[PDB]
Amino acid sequence: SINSREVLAEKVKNAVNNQPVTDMHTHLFSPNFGEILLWDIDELLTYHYLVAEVMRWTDVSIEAFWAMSKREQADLIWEELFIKRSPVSEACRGVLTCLQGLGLDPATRDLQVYREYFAKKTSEEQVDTVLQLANVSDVVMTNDPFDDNERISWLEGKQPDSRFHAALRLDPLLNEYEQTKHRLRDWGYKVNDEWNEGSIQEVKRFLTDWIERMDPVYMAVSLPPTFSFPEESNRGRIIRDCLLPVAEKHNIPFAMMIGVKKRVHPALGDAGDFVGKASMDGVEHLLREYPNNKFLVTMLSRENQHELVVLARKFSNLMIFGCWWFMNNPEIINEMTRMRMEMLGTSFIPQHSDARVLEQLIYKWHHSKSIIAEVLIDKYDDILQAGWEVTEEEIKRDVADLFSRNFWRFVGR
Amino acid sequence: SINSREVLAEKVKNAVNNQPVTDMHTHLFSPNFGEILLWDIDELLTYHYLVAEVMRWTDVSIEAFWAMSKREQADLIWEELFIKRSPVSEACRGVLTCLQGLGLDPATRDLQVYREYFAKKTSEEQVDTVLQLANVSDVVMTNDPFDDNERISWLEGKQPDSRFHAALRLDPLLNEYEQTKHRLRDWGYKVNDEWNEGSIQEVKRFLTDWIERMDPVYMAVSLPPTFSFPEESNRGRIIRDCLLPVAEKHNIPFAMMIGVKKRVHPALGDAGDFVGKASMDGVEHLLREYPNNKFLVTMLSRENQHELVVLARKFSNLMIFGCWWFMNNPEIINEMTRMRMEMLGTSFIPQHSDARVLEQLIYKWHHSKSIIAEVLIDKYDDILQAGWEVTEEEIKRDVADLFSRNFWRFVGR
């Protein structure tokens, strides 16, 4: 038996730390895909989270910033966010956690010595190291066929190694059909000006072709705060007539990441997206009217979090996951995870890294696991208090569900 | 349930704070004995501990000090030890704890106002107040029949109320028999020039008459660092032929307070006593050779404390008690209480107040309980972390033993 919270805490932390992670959403790529996989300290420092933060302090114009080299941008951000002010933000703290995890010494602030660590290694070797340090067993990528570069890799016959899984990302198709439909035809998809049977069949054929090629764990899309469904728009029709029917046939979940208001500040590039609270109506309708379809949902607005949890209590075909983007901060991760566990027990996926740079797997999982561990400790302590006898083996089981099994069980893999 | 140091701390502190205390050695007297019972702020300030301390600072002569009135003495000490220097010593801190405990605010340093509180109250009322505030149920006195003022009270029928118990103090008889024997014969006890049957029987008769009149919980004596037993001396023969036989007969324990070197500085009066390490040979012999006699022991030298604990491990008829006088300081109370618990568990009496002024019951027990609580928390947490179940009921039981039951169980009442 575990007769003290102090021992419980030790056992929970060990279980959480030792549990291999299935990161169901990132922007990483299998090493064999090439340069598309970003990594190293200069990439860490130029993460768009830090671009947005440095612009709040630096007097260097954004145009000038984009004009300088990768190394130069990294030097500015380091100096502005780490030296001129203490690197206390979550994103800056993350950079330090990565350095320490790699065996480097943040206390020296010797950026050139840090850069030297990476220069003497290959992509293949760094992924081996990072996956080991972050104890991540499986990585789900974001695979967009509309991106020429990435698309070439799939066209070439490249296959991700066993540690990487594909996810068919469809923002262009579902959100910019009017402009995208012209590319589909360039590829042999006979989509017509009007939405008839021929257009529907060709879109599905498109979806089906890529599903066969990537063997994705799910199809995904990021939607605006004004997302609605049903809706008489290209998106509404594509989802109704093509995506859902196909998703059902192949029994693959549809991942919806709702809440993002793209480019409210275009000059900032990837760092220029905002957020807004969304209506739950469309998700409510999708879940109810399509019981044979599986939905993975994460929302961007803090104000959408609690009702999303309640919606999960209503529908079993809904699997909520992670603390996305602006939600990926300790104060928010903590409240989200507690609301979720209190109303759903362990039937949810608490987190994903959303890593854009390989090394971030270290900090994203380190910072998140410690928070998740604290929550589990409280919840286990409360039932131990109620006389329940939790075993270390049950704790390991629960932890496996949260960090890995719940995802594979839901996707059916 | 109690499953963390944090929960444990709360329960222990609560149980300790709520446990009614039996103070087994004090210099307080049941209120009906008259002015011999000292109380109020001026008495607190003139406690001999503060007399010793003020003389290290004041340019006022010790002879001039004794010549001043009580209020003048109090004003000087207050001025010298509280105003001219921060009152950080244990005895000065204690005065402050009493004031606060009575609802008076030390923040104001308004001595005239503190005094008004006492003036509008009687001895009987202050006793009620203090016993309630210090949560002391029983007070054991020090009753010296050789003191003319004390002896007349007992002979004239004075008897303590239920909250006060007597202890027959015998220092003059055991340590000054050559002078004291003449007083015994003046009182009708035919002690002879030589230690013969007649002398032995009359001394026994003296002890029996006083036991019947006082119904003492024990007979006591303070002894010098040079104490020895067996010993061919008046003390050695009185203890062997008179005290031990009488104590066994009435099943009354014999309390020995060892290590005091009386009057090394005569001019300081009650404040002129020093300390010295004693040999354990005498105590060891008494315990081994008189298995049917009970011994309460407390020693004055810091260097005697560890071996006294080991001696208790050897003899069940030895019950050690308190952190006496110069031992009654936080640093020492802590080490003594920990060594005691580690080697004796709960089979000892951790403390007594030795209160000379009524209000001291407040600070003596509050200062001690906080330290004793901390020790218990450490000790209970060590076994809790080891897998042991500690219930709030077992804590109250143990705390009751330490602060009350152990004493009464030992005295046989």
Add this chain to the structure above:
Amino acid sequence: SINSREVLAEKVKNAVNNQPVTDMHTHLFSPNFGEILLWDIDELLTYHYLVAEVMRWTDVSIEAFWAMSKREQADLIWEELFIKRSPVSEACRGVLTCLQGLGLDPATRDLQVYREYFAKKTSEEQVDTVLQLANVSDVVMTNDPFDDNERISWLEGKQPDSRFHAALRLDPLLNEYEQTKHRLRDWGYKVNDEWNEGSIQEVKRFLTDWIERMDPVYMAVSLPPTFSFPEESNRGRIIRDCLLPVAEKHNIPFAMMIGVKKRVHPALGDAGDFVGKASMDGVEHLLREYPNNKFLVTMLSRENQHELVVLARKFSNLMIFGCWWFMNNPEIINEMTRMRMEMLGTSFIPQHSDARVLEQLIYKWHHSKSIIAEVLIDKYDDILQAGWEVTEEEIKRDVADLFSRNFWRFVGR
């Protein structure tokens, strides 16, 4: 009027760190006295404390040690105590604190670079640097007229600058009179074979001559555990008939450092002295029988510390000081300072450095001040809890007393 614990700790540590220190016992000398003033890393590393410690490790014989040069000894000690084993002992920790305080960096472990720092400075410059860093305003030397080198200097005019003060050390006179009276005769002091009026006056004359030449703040002597008084020995007679009367006439305190057992291991030189517990009988008699004399006392045995504190409670003509030699270790300094403040408030002198090497003032005072601040904080906090509120001015007053005013007020200078 501080009411929060965080602010209290802040002000206390500030007062302690800002308070200019009077180091009332050292083995340092005014820089103008010449080579006699030891300084630099080589001196710090060869301090006899480290000699004793390296011998427990190194296979190099003591004779070989003494045979090698100073720089060679320093190299062995550095290697044996800092490189082969972590420098965790108090003495080794001290060397490090010194190097760091001077702006040097222990992280590099570059002994040669450290040495270069000292090579570019003069003795007068380093004392300026060290006295400023250790914030020491007054240094009391140990001046022995029996040492040829030192004696010639006092005779050849030499005078210390205003920052250094003299203390007349009399070990040879009080402890080796039989062999010393012959030198007294060589100096014009015709002591008689027997102890009579002539001998008494010539010894007095000797003391008075040196008192006028050195103008010492006190006369001192280190005594063995067997020290007794009164005593029919040269030491007993000299102290009774010469030292005390002269000390009183000049109102000069008599400093006794009791407990050292000289040269139990002669081959270790200054590192060959041992320790033993002393009887308090002689000190008690001195204080009681000579109320017009002032005594400064420090003892070497851990086991004498508590009773010495109690003796201070008895006699105001006793001022206890420092944590001497084998007592100058954190664990002991802590228990000693707490026992003292608990029974004496602020009426004592907590520490002295005993510096034999100039730079030691940095570590000696940095290590002790942090401990004394801790004790003060706890004690101030305890009365704060009782409702008493101190002002920042009273704290500075108290701190000044402990680190400087108590000493000067006691010697009457």
